[PDB]
């Protein structure tokens, strides 16, 4: 049954693809669709387990850990590979149920004192930046030795879910730099996704890649300069989005269909038919 | 086929296509049918896709492709009434309905010119027991000289239940407009705003020399498109932008 195995394998690959492309705030609905369409719960819960985790890490799903005030983001940088994720702010790991989006079983996690003060300073600066620039944003900052370099990875998430009004949106941004005095390269990606689906399906998908440089000196000064780069680039991106919206409304849209013919009257269908 | 009265998979498929990115409808629809091949005909008919343009090489005119003028892998031209590639037994309208289809195509080509001043249109009709149904297709792309690109697809399905003894008919119009805007500028990076809205109207009318089917249908399509255009402007450039700025 080689041909049948290829078909179940392809069906699960399709199901996983659909699940990972669910809009923000609509995972459950897409999952239910895919489950009923695949009609094989075993193929699904094993063959698509990776899709649940991939979606959550791709979306920077924020999660609340009981006993700690600030939420942590589920990201690829916190994946311990064993079902647990890292909270680099509270120096703990926690089990994460990707389907129920539940954090449990906090346990101390040992981290490297090398990157610790650089990470903490960037986190403190980033949290203050997010509190001021987002209505209800969350952020998580990691510090790792990666392919041979001390690296800081800052992640920001912000969503608004209003399914009763048939729309959901999410902002994600990710920022990386290596602690390489005197000057380090900054790489980042900014992402927006908005879904409106009252009597239709309209989606904004946007992303911007960033390359910049930051002066690396002390932990606290570098952290200040890093957030400055973040603020400048996120503000520029958001302003560019609005300016493009304006051009789309007042130019692009009008080159498609007119409001009325050049006659400035509705159509005389008797004249069209004679 | 609509073979099942209770079909939870069909409902889930349509729900799913309201949620996956409309930028990937074509690939998603094909993968979706792989999952539920027995819904192939239902999904091809019910999931709207961006319209493709073909060239009728007999008359030298473009026409629009959709499921409604397809048979196998061949598509029927509204201008020549022939399938490309050739098909010896393709679905064809009746001789009487083809005459109406020709007039409708001429009429909506004028509608296209007046409201869109460009683009391409096509009308395809097919017979029903006590009436007929049709699709009116319009595709218009914006200026390719511009960094911000746009494209408009109209998909109007009309179902006409005729009551000739009363010289009236009942019209049901289901209209989708797919609106696509895209740019890769320095400031915003990549920005893709795309998708569709669908609305429906029904109305009874007299059918006569002074108000024939094409005039009854034209007025409905005109009213619907004028309304949808205004809703699209509000939803795309008002609502989705306000959502963005509510995120940050």
């Amino acid at each position: 049954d080689f041909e049948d195995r290829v078909s179940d394998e392809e069906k699960v690959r399709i199901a996983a693809k659909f699940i990972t492309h669910a809009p923000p705030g609509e995972f459950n609905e897409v999952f239910n669709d895919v489950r009923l369409l695949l009609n094989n719960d075993n193929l699904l819960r094993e063959g698509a387990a990776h899709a649940f985790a991939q979606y959550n890490m791709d979306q920077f799903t924020p999660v609340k850990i009981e006993g700690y005030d600030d939420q942590v983001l589920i990201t690829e940088h916190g994946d311990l590979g064993n079902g647990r994720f890292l909270d680099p702010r509270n120096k703990i790991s926690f089990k994460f149920d990707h389907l129920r989006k539940e954090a449990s079983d906090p346990q101390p996690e040992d981290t490297e004192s090398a990157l610790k003060q650089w990470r903490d300073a960037c986190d403190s600066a980033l949290r203050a930046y997010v509190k001021d620039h987002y209505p209800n944003g969350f952020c998580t900052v990691y510090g790792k030795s990666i392919d041979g370099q001390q690296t800081i990875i800052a992640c920001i998430e912000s969503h608004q879910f209003q399914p009763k009004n048939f729309w959901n949106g999410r902002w994600r941004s990710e920022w990386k730099f290596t602690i390489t005095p005197p000057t380090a390269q900054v790489a980042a990606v900014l992402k927006i996704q908005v879904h409106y689906y009252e009597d239709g399906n309209v989606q904004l998908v946007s992303h911007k890649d960033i390359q910049d440089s930051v002066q690396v000196s002390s932990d606290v000064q570098t952290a200040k300069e890093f957030i400055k780069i973040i603020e400048n680039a996120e503000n520029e991106y958001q302003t560019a989005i609005s300016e493009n919206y304006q051009t789309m409304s007042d130019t692009t849209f009008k080159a498609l269909r007119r409001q009325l013919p050049v006659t400035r009257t509705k159509i005389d269908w008797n004249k069209i038919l004679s | 086929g609509s073979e099942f009265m209770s079909d939870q998979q069909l409902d889930c498929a349509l729900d799913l296509m309201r949620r996956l990115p409309p930028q990937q409808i074509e690939k998603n629809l094909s993968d979706l049918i792989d999952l539920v091949p027995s819904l192939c005909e239902d999904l091809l008919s019910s999931v709207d896709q961006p319209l493709k343009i073909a060239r009728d090489k007999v008359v030298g005119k473009d026409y629009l492709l959709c499921d409604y003028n397809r048979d196998g892998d061949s598509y029927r031209s509204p201008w020549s009434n022939k399938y490309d590639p050739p098909l010896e037994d393709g679905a064809m309208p009746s001789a009487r309905l083809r005459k109406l289809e020709v007039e409708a195509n001429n009429a909506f080509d004028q509608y296209r010119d007046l409201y869109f001043e460009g683009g391409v249109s096509s009308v395809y009709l097919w017979d029903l027991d006590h009436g007929f149904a049709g699709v009116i297709l319009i595709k218009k792309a914006g200026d390719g000289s511009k960094k911000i690109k746009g494209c408009w697809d109209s998909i109007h399905v009309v179902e006409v239940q005729e009551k000739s003894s009363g010289r009236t008919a009942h019209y049901k119009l289901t209209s989708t407009v797919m609106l696509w805007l895209q740019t890769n500028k320095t400031g915003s990076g990549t920005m893709n705003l795309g998708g569709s809205l669908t609305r429906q109207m029904e109305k009874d009318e007299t059918v006569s020399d002074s108000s024939p089917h094409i005039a009854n249908i034209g007025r409905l399509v005109e009213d619907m498109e004028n309304k949808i255009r205004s809703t699209l402007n509000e939803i795309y450039f008002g609502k989705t932008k306000d959502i963005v700025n509510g995120l940050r």
Partner: peptide, 25 residues
Amino acid sequence: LTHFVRERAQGPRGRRLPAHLQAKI
């Protein structure tokens, strides 16, 4: 969600399917 397209008139019955989808039957 409700779907105007679910009951939207479908094209004629009994037409051949496209080849790329025939392979999925």
